[PDB]
């Protein structure tokens with residue numbers, strides 16, 4: 001009645017925000033049974049994102065005895081690619097000392113070949129459809145893999161999904177896609193593959209919880225917060241998250257963003273504590289045109305848009321989770 | 326015996342690897358001060374990182390505390406702005422926010438704020454009982470100031486000056502619309518300062534130019550080696566810094582990240598790491614396309630042929646110290 005863990009799959013695209021989300025899920029086995037991860041070649045190069053996924057899985061397996069799980073590289077291709085400079089992060093993370101602990105390298109080298117054989121889209125479909133319990137899918141990259149599953153399997157897939165918790169969009173606030181060919185109204189995850197986003201968000205047979213910029217822009221990650229990880233440096237997960245957040249805040253200074261934001265980590269937070277935000281049912285359009293507003297998600301089935309997330313609850317959740325090991 | 330050393334640096338990842346190498350080897354090096362210049366960093370951030378590393382090593386291995394001074398030297402030609410934020414980033418890293426180190430630095434910072442960096446360099450060298458080796462990993466401005474103000478009263482107490490700078494027989498690395506690519510950054514930042522120091526017969530200069538440094542790349546396969554040593558704070562520090570460095574050269578399309586400043590400190594620890602060629606240099610101090618160039622023309626001693634294996638061994642041994 002409150003004592004069972006949720007069955008979860010992480011469908012991610014391999015950047016620092018995606019891995020904070022991953023750590024949040026995997027560090028909390030009382031609440032979350034992580035049965036698979038999918039990596040997409042969007043905010044990463046897929047080979048690097050795959051390797052970092054595998055190292056984190058192996059480290060947690062060693063330290064807290066969380067189960068191993070299948071990991072699959074999606075063959076989904078971009079409609080609009082992420083900026084090249086942004087996609088090298090997973091490569092950089094795979095050189096970090098906390099991801100090269102000798103036992104973790106040894107176990108991942110052993111498990112990598114069996115996971116190499118997986119097709120990411122098909123793995124998502126298979127894990128959901130064979131599962132005894134309904135599955136929560138946490139989507140922190142684009143919606144291409146979910147769209148593929150709906151297209152190929154329809155209700156045979158959707159009837160086994162509990163809900164889809166998604167990072168994407170911008171409803172009542174500005175977007176973050178700033179290119180010579182865009183108007184700044186779209187958000188990146190949607191812009192990467194707008195028709196996929198439309199297929200998923202408009203499907204009445206899947207419940208979508210949407211963390212758009214409306215919510216995620218209210219949870220900045222600042223220097224004063226990043227520096228809190230030093231007090232917990234004895235824990236591997238605090239080394240990892242501290243480092244990743246430090247790297248992220250630096251990126252936003254270099255890119256002249258107002259701030260770095262929790263972004264993807266909020267989807268995972270919601271799965272762990274669904275009172276962290278309130279939900280507004282909203283009908284959305286998804287702009288799939290080739291105009292300046294491609295990928296826009298303006299107000300127009302109801303999508304459930306996360307509103308007003310608790311900064312304090314998020315902070316408490318991240319700091320407790322990163323003391324797990 | 327230990328050599329008495331000062332580090333005159335400008336606050337980026339290569340400077341801090343050099344610092345770690347010096348400070349982790351008290352049997353060989355007595356580090357009596359550090360100077361930070363507002364060149365490849367913003368000086369306030371470079372100052373704070375210097376302090377935190379000092380405090381961490383004091384805590385872990387009981388190395389002495391020492392004065393740290395911010396130089397007020399100003400750039401002739403500033404480093405690219407986007408490169409200068411590294412020290413700020415490092416000061417957010419968890420290995421530099423261990424609570425005891427933060428606390429000790431908050432106590433010691435105000436006493437060091439009073440120091441003028443140029444004057445501190447002069448004062449430390451001139452009051453030292455032994456002759457001092459100055460390890461210069463940023464621009465030559467502070468050494469030039471000391472020579473200008475105090476002349477032989479200063480230089481007569483310098484054992485030798487070990488400097489990161491120049492490119493003699495190879496191309497440079499200063500790529501701007503107003504340059505030809507023949508000059509190296511440390512020299513370009515302040516060419517007249519470099520000319521004053523390199524051309525002074527009364528100071529013995531050991532010069533690590535791109536000729537030497539570009540033969541000692543830092544590659545992924547190497548950086549990953551720090552994982553085996555992650556229980557050591559210095560390995561978390563150097564591993565992370567080199568990971569960050571190799572990333573920067575990917576983004577910037579460099580052929581590789583290079584040891585750079587870390588080789589000067591390596592040389593102080595093991596002088597057989599490289600051979601030395603005596604060479605007369607010119608320093609181009611004009612405003613032309615070749616500003617800052619150090620072409621063959623007193624003899625400067627140019628490092629040649631540094632041992633990659635010795636360097637690797639030294640860095641890995643040093644980062645298992647704590």
Ligand SMILES: [Ca+2]
Pocket residue numbers: 012013014015017018043140141264
């Ligand atoms: Ca993502």
Ligand SMILES: [Ca+2]
Pocket residue numbers: 334335336337339340365462463586
């Ligand atoms: Ca330097």
Ligand code: NI
Pocket residue numbers: 001002003004
């Ligand atoms: Ni229950």
Ligand code: NI
Pocket residue numbers: 015017018043263264
């Ligand atoms: Ni992201």
Ligand code: NI
Pocket residue numbers: 070114118
């Ligand atoms: Ni399989």
Ligand code: NI
Pocket residue numbers: 228315319
């Ligand atoms: Ni707190």
Ligand code: NI
Pocket residue numbers: 337339340365585586
């Ligand atoms: Ni440098």
Ligand code: NI
Pocket residue numbers: 383
């Ligand atoms: Ni003490």
Ligand code: NI
Pocket residue numbers: 392436440
């Ligand atoms: Ni003093």
Ligand code: NI
Pocket residue numbers: 575576578
């Ligand atoms: Ni490139």
Ligand code: NI
Pocket residue numbers: 550637641
């Ligand atoms: Ni080795």
